Design a protein around this ligand. Structure first.
Ligand code: ARE
Ligand code: CA
Length: 585
Protein backbone atom coordinates (compact mmCIF):
# COMPACT_ATOMS: atom_id res chain seq x y z
CA UNK A 1 0.00 0.00 0.00
CA UNK A 2 0.98 3.54 -0.77
CA UNK A 3 2.73 5.12 2.15
CA UNK A 4 3.10 8.37 0.15
CA UNK A 5 -0.75 8.76 0.51
CA UNK A 6 -0.90 8.05 4.22
CA UNK A 7 -1.45 11.13 6.44
CA UNK A 8 -1.95 12.23 10.01
CA UNK A 9 -0.68 15.07 12.28
CA UNK A 10 -1.40 15.33 16.00
CA UNK A 11 -3.16 18.83 15.73
CA UNK A 12 -5.66 20.77 13.50
CA UNK A 13 -8.37 18.59 11.89
CA UNK A 14 -6.44 15.34 12.28
CA UNK A 15 -6.33 15.26 16.07
CA UNK A 16 -8.45 17.37 18.38
CA UNK A 17 -10.48 17.11 21.63
CA UNK A 18 -14.25 16.61 21.91
CA UNK A 19 -14.26 16.85 25.71
CA UNK A 20 -11.63 17.07 28.31
CA UNK A 21 -10.94 13.38 28.33
CA UNK A 22 -11.58 12.26 24.74
CA UNK A 23 -9.53 12.93 21.56
CA UNK A 24 -10.86 12.59 17.99
CA UNK A 25 -8.28 11.40 15.50
CA UNK A 26 -8.34 10.90 11.70
CA UNK A 27 -6.08 9.30 9.19
CA UNK A 28 -6.23 9.44 5.45
CA UNK A 29 -4.98 6.74 3.08
CA UNK A 30 -5.20 6.03 -0.72
CA UNK A 31 -8.85 4.98 -1.36
CA UNK A 32 -8.96 1.19 -1.02
CA UNK A 33 -5.48 0.64 0.62
CA UNK A 34 -6.59 0.21 4.21
CA UNK A 35 -9.54 -1.95 5.29
CA UNK A 36 -8.66 -1.75 8.97
CA UNK A 37 -7.35 1.11 10.99
CA UNK A 38 -6.69 0.63 14.63
CA UNK A 39 -5.25 2.97 17.27
CA UNK A 40 -3.05 1.59 19.94
CA UNK A 41 -2.67 4.23 22.67
CA UNK A 42 -1.67 5.09 26.28
CA UNK A 43 -0.91 7.67 28.78
CA UNK A 44 2.15 9.70 27.71
CA UNK A 45 3.97 8.70 30.84
CA UNK A 46 2.66 5.00 30.82
CA UNK A 47 5.45 2.49 31.86
CA UNK A 48 6.76 0.50 28.75
CA UNK A 49 5.11 -2.55 30.39
CA UNK A 50 1.50 -1.44 30.63
CA UNK A 51 -0.84 -2.78 27.89
CA UNK A 52 -1.90 -0.49 25.12
CA UNK A 53 -5.52 0.78 24.79
CA UNK A 54 -7.30 -0.10 21.49
CA UNK A 55 -9.69 2.05 19.58
CA UNK A 56 -10.75 0.91 16.21
CA UNK A 57 -11.24 3.73 13.63
CA UNK A 58 -14.25 3.50 11.31
CA UNK A 59 -14.09 4.80 7.78
CA UNK A 60 -15.91 8.13 8.00
CA UNK A 61 -15.79 8.93 4.30
CA UNK A 62 -14.03 8.88 0.90
CA UNK A 63 -13.32 11.48 -1.73
CA UNK A 64 -11.82 11.36 -5.22
CA UNK A 65 -8.48 9.90 -4.06
CA UNK A 66 -8.64 9.02 -0.26
CA UNK A 67 -10.44 7.14 2.42
CA UNK A 68 -10.69 8.82 5.79
CA UNK A 69 -10.63 7.02 9.11
CA UNK A 70 -11.91 8.22 12.39
CA UNK A 71 -11.49 7.09 15.92
CA UNK A 72 -12.22 8.32 19.44
CA UNK A 73 -9.48 8.03 22.14
CA UNK A 74 -10.49 7.74 25.85
CA UNK A 75 -7.83 9.66 27.75
CA UNK A 76 -8.55 9.72 31.49
CA UNK A 77 -5.11 11.24 32.05
CA UNK A 78 -5.83 13.82 29.35
CA UNK A 79 -2.37 13.20 27.95
CA UNK A 80 -2.15 10.65 25.09
CA UNK A 81 0.50 8.96 22.88
CA UNK A 82 -0.53 6.55 20.06
CA UNK A 83 0.33 4.54 16.81
CA UNK A 84 -1.95 3.39 14.03
CA UNK A 85 -2.16 -0.21 12.90
CA UNK A 86 -3.22 -0.29 9.35
CA UNK A 87 -4.26 -3.43 7.58
CA UNK A 88 -4.46 -3.90 3.81
CA UNK A 89 -7.00 -6.00 1.88
CA UNK A 90 -4.52 -9.04 1.76
CA UNK A 91 -3.80 -8.68 5.52
CA UNK A 92 -0.48 -6.65 5.21
CA UNK A 93 -0.06 -4.86 8.55
CA UNK A 94 1.93 -1.77 9.08
CA UNK A 95 2.41 0.48 12.03
CA UNK A 96 2.12 4.18 11.42
CA UNK A 97 3.59 6.60 13.97
CA UNK A 98 5.57 9.90 14.30
CA UNK A 99 8.86 8.20 13.52
CA UNK A 100 7.42 6.63 10.36
CA UNK A 101 6.26 3.25 9.05
CA UNK A 102 7.46 -0.27 10.18
CA UNK A 103 6.22 -3.80 10.70
CA UNK A 104 7.53 -3.35 14.26
CA UNK A 105 5.31 -1.29 16.41
CA UNK A 106 8.25 0.12 18.36
CA UNK A 107 10.00 1.40 15.07
CA UNK A 108 6.91 3.48 13.99
CA UNK A 109 7.21 5.62 17.14
CA UNK A 110 4.14 7.42 18.61
CA UNK A 111 2.31 10.59 17.79
CA UNK A 112 1.62 12.55 20.98
CA UNK A 113 -1.30 14.83 22.08
CA UNK A 114 0.53 16.37 25.02
CA UNK A 115 -2.43 17.70 26.93
CA UNK A 116 -6.19 18.42 26.55
CA UNK A 117 -6.99 21.77 28.18
CA UNK A 118 -10.74 22.30 29.11
CA UNK A 119 -10.38 25.76 27.57
CA UNK A 120 -9.06 24.31 24.32
CA UNK A 121 -12.17 22.19 23.63
CA UNK A 122 -13.87 23.79 20.53
CA UNK A 123 -17.36 24.70 21.82
CA UNK A 124 -20.05 26.61 19.85
CA UNK A 125 -23.50 27.85 21.01
CA UNK A 126 -26.17 25.21 21.23
CA UNK A 127 -28.90 27.11 19.50
CA UNK A 128 -26.64 27.38 16.39
CA UNK A 129 -26.43 23.55 16.06
CA UNK A 130 -30.05 23.57 15.07
CA UNK A 131 -30.79 26.93 13.61
CA UNK A 132 -31.94 28.06 10.17
CA UNK A 133 -30.74 31.56 9.25
CA UNK A 134 -32.36 34.31 7.04
CA UNK A 135 -30.24 36.99 5.46
CA UNK A 136 -31.77 40.51 5.23
CA UNK A 137 -30.13 43.20 3.09
CA UNK A 138 -32.17 45.94 4.87
CA UNK A 139 -32.13 48.62 2.12
CA UNK A 140 -34.23 46.21 0.06
CA UNK A 141 -36.36 44.02 2.27
CA UNK A 142 -39.35 46.16 3.44
CA UNK A 143 -40.08 49.93 3.40
CA UNK A 144 -42.13 50.33 6.60
CA UNK A 145 -41.21 53.93 7.10
CA UNK A 146 -41.59 56.06 3.94
CA UNK A 147 -40.67 59.25 5.88
CA UNK A 148 -37.05 58.13 6.30
CA UNK A 149 -36.57 57.22 2.59
CA UNK A 150 -33.32 58.45 1.02
CA UNK A 151 -33.36 61.02 -1.78
CA UNK A 152 -34.22 59.71 -5.19
CA UNK A 153 -35.72 56.51 -3.90
CA UNK A 154 -36.91 54.58 -7.01
CA UNK A 155 -40.12 52.68 -6.93
CA UNK A 156 -40.65 49.44 -5.16
CA UNK A 157 -42.00 47.30 -7.90
CA UNK A 158 -42.12 43.57 -8.88
CA UNK A 159 -39.16 44.01 -11.40
CA UNK A 160 -37.14 47.21 -10.82
CA UNK A 161 -33.46 46.59 -11.88
CA UNK A 162 -31.19 48.29 -9.23
CA UNK A 163 -28.11 50.23 -10.25
CA UNK A 164 -24.85 50.37 -8.12
CA UNK A 165 -26.14 53.57 -6.40
CA UNK A 166 -29.98 52.95 -6.13
CA UNK A 167 -32.22 53.33 -3.10
CA UNK A 168 -35.66 51.66 -2.54
CA UNK A 169 -36.35 52.68 1.06
CA UNK A 170 -36.11 49.34 2.96
CA UNK A 171 -35.70 50.02 6.65
CA UNK A 172 -35.92 48.51 10.15
CA UNK A 173 -39.63 49.34 10.72
CA UNK A 174 -40.27 47.11 7.62
CA UNK A 175 -38.48 44.20 9.27
CA UNK A 176 -40.60 44.75 12.42
CA UNK A 177 -43.70 44.72 10.30
CA UNK A 178 -42.71 41.55 8.37
CA UNK A 179 -41.73 39.55 11.44
CA UNK A 180 -44.94 37.45 11.19
CA UNK A 181 -43.95 36.45 7.73
CA UNK A 182 -40.54 35.41 9.02
CA UNK A 183 -41.94 33.57 12.00
CA UNK A 184 -44.40 31.70 9.73
CA UNK A 185 -41.46 30.65 7.50
CA UNK A 186 -39.82 29.13 10.65
CA UNK A 187 -36.49 30.96 10.65
CA UNK A 188 -34.68 31.17 14.00
CA UNK A 189 -32.10 33.85 13.29
CA UNK A 190 -31.63 36.99 11.15
CA UNK A 191 -28.31 37.95 9.41
CA UNK A 192 -28.34 41.71 8.78
CA UNK A 193 -26.09 43.12 6.21
CA UNK A 194 -24.43 46.39 7.71
CA UNK A 195 -26.92 48.82 9.36
CA UNK A 196 -24.65 51.49 10.84
CA UNK A 197 -24.65 55.05 9.62
CA UNK A 198 -23.17 55.17 6.16
CA UNK A 199 -23.87 57.09 2.99
CA UNK A 200 -24.59 54.19 0.55
CA UNK A 201 -27.06 51.41 -0.08
CA UNK A 202 -24.82 48.67 1.36
CA UNK A 203 -23.39 50.74 4.19
CA UNK A 204 -19.98 48.90 4.11
CA UNK A 205 -18.13 52.29 4.19
CA UNK A 206 -19.13 53.17 7.77
CA UNK A 207 -19.46 56.79 8.79
CA UNK A 208 -20.39 55.95 12.34
CA UNK A 209 -20.06 52.53 14.09
CA UNK A 210 -22.13 53.64 17.00
CA UNK A 211 -25.40 54.69 15.31
CA UNK A 212 -28.27 53.17 13.33
CA UNK A 213 -28.18 54.79 9.86
CA UNK A 214 -30.97 57.49 9.95
CA UNK A 215 -32.64 56.03 6.84
CA UNK A 216 -32.86 52.61 8.65
CA UNK A 217 -34.17 54.02 11.93
CA UNK A 218 -32.72 55.03 15.25
CA UNK A 219 -31.66 53.06 18.26
CA UNK A 220 -35.18 52.86 19.82
CA UNK A 221 -36.45 51.25 16.61
CA UNK A 222 -33.58 48.75 16.74
CA UNK A 223 -34.29 47.77 20.34
CA UNK A 224 -37.95 47.42 19.37
CA UNK A 225 -36.68 45.11 16.63
CA UNK A 226 -34.40 42.89 18.86
CA UNK A 227 -37.27 42.35 21.27
CA UNK A 228 -39.92 41.83 18.72
CA UNK A 229 -37.74 39.21 17.06
CA UNK A 230 -36.73 37.60 20.28
CA UNK A 231 -40.38 37.05 21.38
CA UNK A 232 -40.83 35.07 18.15
CA UNK A 233 -37.89 32.79 18.63
CA UNK A 234 -35.71 34.80 16.23
CA UNK A 235 -32.14 35.81 17.02
CA UNK A 236 -30.25 38.85 15.63
CA UNK A 237 -26.76 38.58 14.02
CA UNK A 238 -25.02 41.82 12.95
CA UNK A 239 -22.44 42.45 10.27
CA UNK A 240 -19.26 43.74 11.89
CA UNK A 241 -17.24 45.62 9.28
CA UNK A 242 -13.93 45.81 11.05
CA UNK A 243 -11.42 45.42 8.21
CA UNK A 244 -11.87 48.99 6.91
CA UNK A 245 -13.76 52.18 7.82
CA UNK A 246 -15.69 54.47 5.49
CA UNK A 247 -14.05 57.74 4.31
CA UNK A 248 -16.41 59.60 6.78
CA UNK A 249 -15.32 57.80 9.85
CA UNK A 250 -14.39 60.53 12.46
CA UNK A 251 -10.75 59.43 12.68
CA UNK A 252 -10.28 59.36 8.95
CA UNK A 253 -11.90 62.76 8.50
CA UNK A 254 -9.38 63.93 11.02
CA UNK A 255 -6.79 62.39 8.78
CA UNK A 256 -8.05 64.10 5.56
CA UNK A 257 -8.09 67.37 7.49
CA UNK A 258 -5.01 67.42 9.61
CA UNK A 259 -2.63 65.35 7.38
CA UNK A 260 0.16 64.17 9.68
CA UNK A 261 -0.89 66.24 12.63
CA UNK A 262 -3.84 63.75 13.03
CA UNK A 263 -3.75 61.83 16.28
CA UNK A 264 -5.31 59.11 13.99
CA UNK A 265 -2.67 58.78 11.28
CA UNK A 266 -1.45 55.32 12.48
CA UNK A 267 -5.03 54.02 12.52
CA UNK A 268 -4.68 53.65 8.74
CA UNK A 269 -2.23 52.58 6.06
CA UNK A 270 -1.24 56.06 4.73
CA UNK A 271 1.24 55.85 1.82
CA UNK A 272 2.10 59.72 1.84
CA UNK A 273 0.53 63.22 2.60
CA UNK A 274 -2.01 64.95 1.76
CA UNK A 275 -4.37 61.92 1.92
CA UNK A 276 -6.69 61.78 -0.95
CA UNK A 277 -5.64 61.46 -4.62
CA UNK A 278 -9.19 59.91 -5.97
CA UNK A 279 -8.69 57.52 -9.06
CA UNK A 280 -5.18 57.28 -7.44
CA UNK A 281 -5.77 56.92 -3.58
CA UNK A 282 -2.47 57.15 -1.61
CA UNK A 283 -3.91 55.00 1.17
CA UNK A 284 -4.74 51.35 1.27
CA UNK A 285 -8.35 50.50 0.81
CA UNK A 286 -10.35 47.39 0.71
CA UNK A 287 -9.89 45.61 -2.65
CA UNK A 288 -8.17 47.98 -5.17
CA UNK A 289 -8.60 51.83 -5.28
CA UNK A 290 -11.75 52.10 -3.16
CA UNK A 291 -11.52 55.54 -1.66
CA UNK A 292 -14.62 55.14 0.62
CA UNK A 293 -13.03 52.16 2.26
CA UNK A 294 -9.65 52.84 3.86
CA UNK A 295 -8.20 49.78 5.63
CA UNK A 296 -8.24 49.98 9.45
CA UNK A 297 -4.96 49.10 11.24
CA UNK A 298 -6.45 46.40 13.54
CA UNK A 299 -2.89 45.54 14.71
CA UNK A 300 -2.99 49.09 16.31
CA UNK A 301 -4.09 48.56 20.00
CA UNK A 302 -5.97 51.86 19.77
CA UNK A 303 -7.90 50.69 16.63
CA UNK A 304 -8.54 47.43 18.38
CA UNK A 305 -9.78 48.96 21.62
CA UNK A 306 -12.17 51.11 19.58
CA UNK A 307 -13.80 48.20 17.64
CA UNK A 308 -13.94 46.23 20.83
CA UNK A 309 -15.91 49.19 22.20
CA UNK A 310 -18.29 49.03 19.27
CA UNK A 311 -18.79 45.34 19.80
CA UNK A 312 -19.70 45.96 23.44
CA UNK A 313 -22.05 48.67 22.60
CA UNK A 314 -24.23 46.66 20.27
CA UNK A 315 -23.99 43.72 22.50
CA UNK A 316 -25.60 45.69 25.21
CA UNK A 317 -28.62 46.08 22.86
CA UNK A 318 -29.05 42.28 23.19
CA UNK A 319 -28.04 41.14 19.68
CA UNK A 320 -26.91 37.54 19.32
CA UNK A 321 -23.62 37.62 17.51
CA UNK A 322 -21.53 38.68 14.57
CA UNK A 323 -20.81 38.08 10.91
CA UNK A 324 -17.32 39.26 10.20
CA UNK A 325 -16.85 41.05 6.97
CA UNK A 326 -13.59 40.40 4.99
CA UNK A 327 -12.56 38.65 8.22
CA UNK A 328 -9.51 36.94 6.72
CA UNK A 329 -7.83 40.26 6.13
CA UNK A 330 -7.72 41.26 9.84
CA UNK A 331 -5.04 39.65 12.08
CA UNK A 332 -5.53 36.42 14.19
CA UNK A 333 -4.66 38.12 17.51
CA UNK A 334 -7.49 40.51 16.94
CA UNK A 335 -9.83 37.58 16.39
CA UNK A 336 -8.68 35.53 19.37
CA UNK A 337 -9.13 38.52 21.67
CA UNK A 338 -12.41 39.41 20.00
CA UNK A 339 -13.67 35.94 20.85
CA UNK A 340 -12.30 36.15 24.50
CA UNK A 341 -14.26 39.40 24.82
CA UNK A 342 -17.44 38.35 22.96
CA UNK A 343 -17.68 34.97 24.74
CA UNK A 344 -17.02 36.71 28.02
CA UNK A 345 -20.02 38.99 27.51
CA UNK A 346 -22.30 36.28 26.19
CA UNK A 347 -21.26 32.60 26.05
CA UNK A 348 -24.05 32.15 23.41
CA UNK A 349 -23.04 35.07 21.10
CA UNK A 350 -22.35 33.36 17.70
CA UNK A 351 -19.25 34.38 15.61
CA UNK A 352 -19.16 33.76 11.82
CA UNK A 353 -16.42 34.87 9.49
CA UNK A 354 -16.80 35.89 5.88
CA UNK A 355 -14.06 33.88 4.25
CA UNK A 356 -14.57 32.15 0.82
CA UNK A 357 -11.55 29.84 0.73
CA UNK A 358 -10.24 27.12 3.12
CA UNK A 359 -11.00 28.72 6.49
CA UNK A 360 -9.36 25.86 8.40
CA UNK A 361 -7.02 28.31 10.15
CA UNK A 362 -9.80 30.30 11.86
CA UNK A 363 -11.77 27.18 12.77
CA UNK A 364 -9.63 25.41 15.29
CA UNK A 365 -11.74 26.75 18.24
CA UNK A 366 -10.09 30.01 19.20
CA UNK A 367 -11.51 32.47 16.73
CA UNK A 368 -14.73 31.88 14.69
CA UNK A 369 -17.51 29.51 15.53
CA UNK A 370 -18.30 29.17 11.83
CA UNK A 371 -17.99 30.74 8.33
CA UNK A 372 -20.19 31.42 5.28
CA UNK A 373 -19.40 28.23 3.63
CA UNK A 374 -18.83 29.41 0.08
CA UNK A 375 -17.16 26.01 -0.54
CA UNK A 376 -20.45 24.32 0.20
CA UNK A 377 -21.93 26.73 -2.38
CA UNK A 378 -19.41 25.88 -5.08
CA UNK A 379 -20.26 22.13 -5.05
CA UNK A 380 -23.93 22.98 -4.92
CA UNK A 381 -23.62 25.23 -7.97
CA UNK A 382 -21.58 23.01 -10.07
CA UNK A 383 -23.83 20.04 -9.27
CA UNK A 384 -27.47 21.13 -9.42
CA UNK A 385 -27.15 24.50 -11.28
CA UNK A 386 -24.46 24.21 -14.01
CA UNK A 387 -24.18 20.43 -13.92
CA UNK A 388 -20.33 20.58 -14.40
CA UNK A 389 -19.96 17.69 -11.95
CA UNK A 390 -21.86 14.40 -11.74
CA UNK A 391 -22.98 12.66 -8.54
CA UNK A 392 -19.68 11.01 -7.68
CA UNK A 393 -17.58 14.15 -7.86
CA UNK A 394 -20.22 15.86 -5.77
CA UNK A 395 -19.76 13.26 -3.11
CA UNK A 396 -16.02 13.72 -3.16
CA UNK A 397 -16.32 17.51 -3.00
CA UNK A 398 -18.77 17.28 -0.06
CA UNK A 399 -16.61 14.84 1.89
CA UNK A 400 -13.27 16.33 1.26
CA UNK A 401 -14.72 19.67 2.40
CA UNK A 402 -16.30 17.94 5.51
CA UNK A 403 -12.88 16.66 6.60
CA UNK A 404 -11.17 20.05 6.31
CA UNK A 405 -12.26 21.24 9.77
CA UNK A 406 -12.98 19.90 13.28
CA UNK A 407 -16.61 18.52 13.55
CA UNK A 408 -17.54 21.30 15.89
CA UNK A 409 -17.04 23.69 12.92
CA UNK A 410 -18.62 21.58 10.23
CA UNK A 411 -21.80 21.05 12.37
CA UNK A 412 -22.68 24.81 12.05
CA UNK A 413 -21.03 26.01 8.84
CA UNK A 414 -23.45 28.54 7.18
CA UNK A 415 -24.37 26.70 4.03
CA UNK A 416 -25.71 29.12 1.51
CA UNK A 417 -26.74 29.05 -2.12
CA UNK A 418 -26.03 32.74 -2.94
CA UNK A 419 -25.68 36.15 -1.24
CA UNK A 420 -25.61 39.91 -1.77
CA UNK A 421 -22.29 39.35 -3.63
CA UNK A 422 -23.69 36.72 -6.01
CA UNK A 423 -26.17 36.01 -8.75
CA UNK A 424 -29.35 34.45 -7.39
CA UNK A 425 -29.40 30.71 -7.18
CA UNK A 426 -32.56 30.33 -9.44
CA UNK A 427 -30.49 32.31 -11.97
CA UNK A 428 -27.52 29.91 -11.77
CA UNK A 429 -30.20 27.21 -12.53
CA UNK A 430 -31.15 29.19 -15.63
CA UNK A 431 -34.60 29.75 -14.04
CA UNK A 432 -35.20 26.04 -13.75
CA UNK A 433 -37.38 25.67 -10.71
CA UNK A 434 -37.16 21.88 -10.52
CA UNK A 435 -33.34 21.91 -10.15
CA UNK A 436 -33.71 24.78 -7.58
CA UNK A 437 -35.99 22.92 -5.18
CA UNK A 438 -33.58 19.95 -5.22
CA UNK A 439 -30.70 22.24 -4.22
CA UNK A 440 -33.03 23.56 -1.47
CA UNK A 441 -33.90 20.10 -0.33
CA UNK A 442 -30.28 19.22 -0.24
CA UNK A 443 -29.56 22.41 1.78
CA UNK A 444 -32.30 21.86 4.27
CA UNK A 445 -31.03 18.25 4.85
CA UNK A 446 -27.20 18.43 4.65
CA UNK A 447 -24.75 18.80 7.63
CA UNK A 448 -24.45 22.46 8.74
CA UNK A 449 -26.68 25.55 9.07
CA UNK A 450 -28.91 26.61 6.15
CA UNK A 451 -28.80 30.27 5.13
CA UNK A 452 -31.75 31.63 3.10
CA UNK A 453 -31.18 34.84 1.08
CA UNK A 454 -34.21 37.10 1.41
CA UNK A 455 -36.50 36.34 -1.54
CA UNK A 456 -35.33 32.89 -2.62
CA UNK A 457 -38.16 31.35 -0.70
CA UNK A 458 -40.77 32.99 -3.03
CA UNK A 459 -38.99 32.84 -6.35
CA UNK A 460 -36.87 35.92 -6.83
CA UNK A 461 -34.25 35.94 -9.64
CA UNK A 462 -31.27 38.18 -10.58
CA UNK A 463 -27.79 38.30 -11.92
CA UNK A 464 -24.98 39.24 -9.52
CA UNK A 465 -24.55 42.41 -7.43
CA UNK A 466 -26.42 44.85 -7.71
CA UNK A 467 -29.02 42.82 -9.51
CA UNK A 468 -29.06 40.08 -6.78
CA UNK A 469 -30.35 42.99 -4.54
CA UNK A 470 -33.82 43.70 -6.03
CA UNK A 471 -36.69 44.89 -3.82
CA UNK A 472 -38.38 41.99 -2.13
CA UNK A 473 -41.65 40.88 -3.85
CA UNK A 474 -44.43 41.23 -1.29
CA UNK A 475 -47.58 40.87 -3.30
CA UNK A 476 -49.07 37.47 -2.67
CA UNK A 477 -49.97 37.02 -6.44
CA UNK A 478 -46.44 37.98 -7.51
CA UNK A 479 -44.89 35.31 -5.20
CA UNK A 480 -44.21 31.59 -5.65
CA UNK A 481 -46.32 30.39 -2.71
CA UNK A 482 -45.74 26.85 -3.85
CA UNK A 483 -42.06 27.37 -3.16
CA UNK A 484 -42.87 29.11 0.08
CA UNK A 485 -44.89 26.13 1.49
CA UNK A 486 -41.95 24.01 0.36
CA UNK A 487 -39.35 25.90 2.52
CA UNK A 488 -41.92 25.89 5.35
CA UNK A 489 -42.38 22.20 5.18
CA UNK A 490 -38.64 21.40 4.93
CA UNK A 491 -37.93 23.74 7.84
CA UNK A 492 -40.37 22.02 10.19
CA UNK A 493 -38.80 18.60 9.31
CA UNK A 494 -35.39 19.93 10.15
CA UNK A 495 -36.95 20.98 13.56
CA UNK A 496 -38.58 17.56 14.28
CA UNK A 497 -35.76 15.17 13.12
CA UNK A 498 -32.78 15.63 15.51
CA UNK A 499 -30.79 13.70 13.03
CA UNK A 500 -30.96 16.64 10.56
CA UNK A 501 -29.74 19.30 13.02
CA UNK A 502 -27.42 17.12 15.03
CA UNK A 503 -26.65 13.82 13.37
CA UNK A 504 -23.52 13.11 11.33
CA UNK A 505 -23.43 12.36 7.54
CA UNK A 506 -22.28 9.33 5.66
CA UNK A 507 -22.52 8.86 1.85
CA UNK A 508 -25.14 6.23 1.10
CA UNK A 509 -25.17 5.81 -2.70
CA UNK A 510 -23.40 7.73 -5.46
CA UNK A 511 -23.74 6.75 -9.11
CA UNK A 512 -22.02 8.97 -11.64
CA UNK A 513 -24.17 7.43 -14.32
CA UNK A 514 -27.75 7.99 -13.02
CA UNK A 515 -26.49 11.16 -11.24
CA UNK A 516 -28.40 9.83 -8.24
CA UNK A 517 -26.81 10.91 -4.92
CA UNK A 518 -27.89 9.72 -1.45
CA UNK A 519 -26.60 10.31 2.13
CA UNK A 520 -27.57 9.42 5.70
CA UNK A 521 -27.94 11.63 8.78
CA UNK A 522 -27.73 9.62 12.07
CA UNK A 523 -27.99 10.69 15.67
CA UNK A 524 -28.38 7.88 18.20
CA UNK A 525 -30.53 5.24 16.39
CA UNK A 526 -32.34 7.77 14.22
CA UNK A 527 -31.51 7.38 10.55
CA UNK A 528 -32.82 9.78 7.99
CA UNK A 529 -31.81 8.96 4.44
CA UNK A 530 -32.04 11.56 1.70
CA UNK A 531 -32.12 10.62 -2.03
CA UNK A 532 -31.53 12.97 -4.89
CA UNK A 533 -32.58 12.19 -8.48
CA UNK A 534 -30.69 15.07 -10.12
CA UNK A 535 -31.57 13.85 -13.64
CA UNK A 536 -34.01 15.11 -16.22
CA UNK A 537 -35.76 11.65 -16.68
CA UNK A 538 -37.25 9.20 -14.22
CA UNK A 539 -35.06 6.36 -12.73
CA UNK A 540 -34.98 3.35 -10.33
CA UNK A 541 -32.29 2.40 -7.74
CA UNK A 542 -31.30 -0.29 -5.42
CA UNK A 543 -29.93 1.13 -2.30
CA UNK A 544 -27.93 -1.07 -0.03
CA UNK A 545 -29.81 -0.94 3.33
CA UNK A 546 -28.75 -3.54 5.88
CA UNK A 547 -31.24 -5.14 8.25
CA UNK A 548 -29.55 -3.44 11.21
CA UNK A 549 -30.62 0.21 10.17
CA UNK A 550 -34.28 -0.78 10.12
CA UNK A 551 -36.08 -2.29 7.12
CA UNK A 552 -39.09 0.08 7.04
CA UNK A 553 -38.90 3.78 6.27
CA UNK A 554 -41.40 6.57 6.01
CA UNK A 555 -40.90 9.14 3.20
CA UNK A 556 -41.36 12.38 5.02
CA UNK A 557 -42.57 14.60 2.23
CA UNK A 558 -45.27 12.36 0.79
CA UNK A 559 -46.09 9.92 3.54
CA UNK A 560 -45.20 6.95 1.40
CA UNK A 561 -44.10 3.83 3.18
CA UNK A 562 -41.12 1.92 1.93
CA UNK A 563 -39.83 -1.59 2.44
CA UNK A 564 -36.55 -3.43 2.17
CA UNK A 565 -36.47 -7.05 0.91
CA UNK A 566 -33.08 -8.64 1.55
CA UNK A 567 -30.57 -5.84 2.53
CA UNK A 568 -32.00 -3.84 -0.35
CA UNK A 569 -34.30 -0.92 -0.99
CA UNK A 570 -35.86 -0.46 -4.51
CA UNK A 571 -36.88 3.15 -5.23
CA UNK A 572 -38.42 4.94 -8.21
CA UNK A 573 -37.86 8.65 -8.32
CA UNK A 574 -39.40 11.26 -10.58
CA UNK A 575 -37.37 13.78 -12.57
CA UNK A 576 -35.39 16.02 -10.14
CA UNK A 577 -37.37 14.37 -7.25
CA UNK A 578 -35.94 13.96 -3.73
CA UNK A 579 -36.97 11.68 -0.87
CA UNK A 580 -36.36 12.07 2.85
CA UNK A 581 -36.63 8.65 4.45
CA UNK A 582 -37.11 8.46 8.26
CA UNK A 583 -36.21 5.12 9.71
CA UNK A 584 -39.00 5.63 12.22
CA UNK A 585 -36.58 5.97 15.10
C1 ARE B 1 -17.56 41.27 -2.53
C2 ARE B 1 -16.52 40.46 -1.78
O1 ARE B 1 -15.22 40.49 -2.42
C3 ARE B 1 -14.34 39.39 -2.11
O2 ARE B 1 -14.90 38.07 -2.66
C4 ARE B 1 -14.10 37.40 -3.72
C5 ARE B 1 -13.19 36.29 -3.06
O3 ARE B 1 -12.21 36.83 -2.18
C6 ARE B 1 -12.53 35.23 -4.00
O4 ARE B 1 -12.27 33.98 -3.26
C7 ARE B 1 -13.45 34.95 -5.20
O5 ARE B 1 -14.42 33.95 -4.77
O6 ARE B 1 -14.28 36.06 -5.66
C8 ARE B 1 -15.07 36.79 -4.72
C9 ARE B 1 -15.70 37.88 -5.59
O7 ARE B 1 -16.96 38.24 -5.05
C10 ARE B 1 -14.01 39.65 -0.62
O8 ARE B 1 -12.96 38.80 -0.14
C11 ARE B 1 -15.29 39.60 0.24
O9 ARE B 1 -15.03 39.63 1.71
C12 ARE B 1 -16.28 40.72 -0.28
N1 ARE B 1 -17.57 40.63 0.44
C13 ARE B 1 -17.76 41.48 1.66
C14 ARE B 1 -16.83 42.73 1.70
C15 ARE B 1 -17.25 43.93 0.83
C16 ARE B 1 -16.52 45.16 1.37
O10 ARE B 1 -17.01 45.45 2.64
C17 ARE B 1 -18.81 44.09 0.62
O11 ARE B 1 -19.07 44.70 -0.63
C18 ARE B 1 -19.45 46.17 -0.55
O12 ARE B 1 -18.46 47.18 -1.02
C19 ARE B 1 -17.99 47.02 -2.41
C20 ARE B 1 -17.03 48.22 -2.61
O13 ARE B 1 -16.97 48.71 -3.97
C21 ARE B 1 -19.18 46.91 -3.43
O14 ARE B 1 -18.72 46.29 -4.65
C22 ARE B 1 -18.21 47.05 -5.81
O15 ARE B 1 -16.77 46.66 -5.98
C23 ARE B 1 -16.57 45.11 -6.21
C24 ARE B 1 -15.04 44.61 -6.23
O16 ARE B 1 -14.78 43.73 -7.36
C25 ARE B 1 -17.45 44.57 -7.43
O17 ARE B 1 -17.40 43.12 -7.54
C26 ARE B 1 -18.92 45.07 -7.36
O18 ARE B 1 -19.67 44.60 -8.52
C27 ARE B 1 -18.99 46.63 -7.08
O19 ARE B 1 -20.32 47.08 -6.85
C28 ARE B 1 -20.36 46.06 -2.86
O20 ARE B 1 -21.49 46.16 -3.67
C29 ARE B 1 -20.74 46.37 -1.38
O21 ARE B 1 -21.76 45.48 -0.85
C30 ARE B 1 -19.54 42.71 0.53
O22 ARE B 1 -20.89 42.86 0.28
C31 ARE B 1 -19.24 41.83 1.76
O23 ARE B 1 -19.91 40.56 1.73
CA1 CA C 1 -37.84 53.71 4.26
Amino acid sequence: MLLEAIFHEAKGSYAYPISETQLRVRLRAKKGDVVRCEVLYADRYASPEEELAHALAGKAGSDERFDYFEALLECSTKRVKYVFLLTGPQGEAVYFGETGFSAERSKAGVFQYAYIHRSEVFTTPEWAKEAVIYQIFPERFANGDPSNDPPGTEQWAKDARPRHDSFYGGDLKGVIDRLPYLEELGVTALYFTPIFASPSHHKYDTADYLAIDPQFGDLPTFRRLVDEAHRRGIKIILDAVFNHAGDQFFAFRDVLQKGEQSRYKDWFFIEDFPVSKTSRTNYETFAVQVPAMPKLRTENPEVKEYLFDVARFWMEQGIDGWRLDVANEVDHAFWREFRRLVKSLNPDALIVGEIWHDASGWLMGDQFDSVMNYLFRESVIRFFATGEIHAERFDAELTRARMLYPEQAAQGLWNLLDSHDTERFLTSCGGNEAKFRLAVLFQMTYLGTPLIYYGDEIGMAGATDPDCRRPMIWEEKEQNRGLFEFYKELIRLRHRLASLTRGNVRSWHADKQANLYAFVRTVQDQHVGVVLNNRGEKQTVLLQVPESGGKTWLDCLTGEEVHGKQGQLKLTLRPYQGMILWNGR
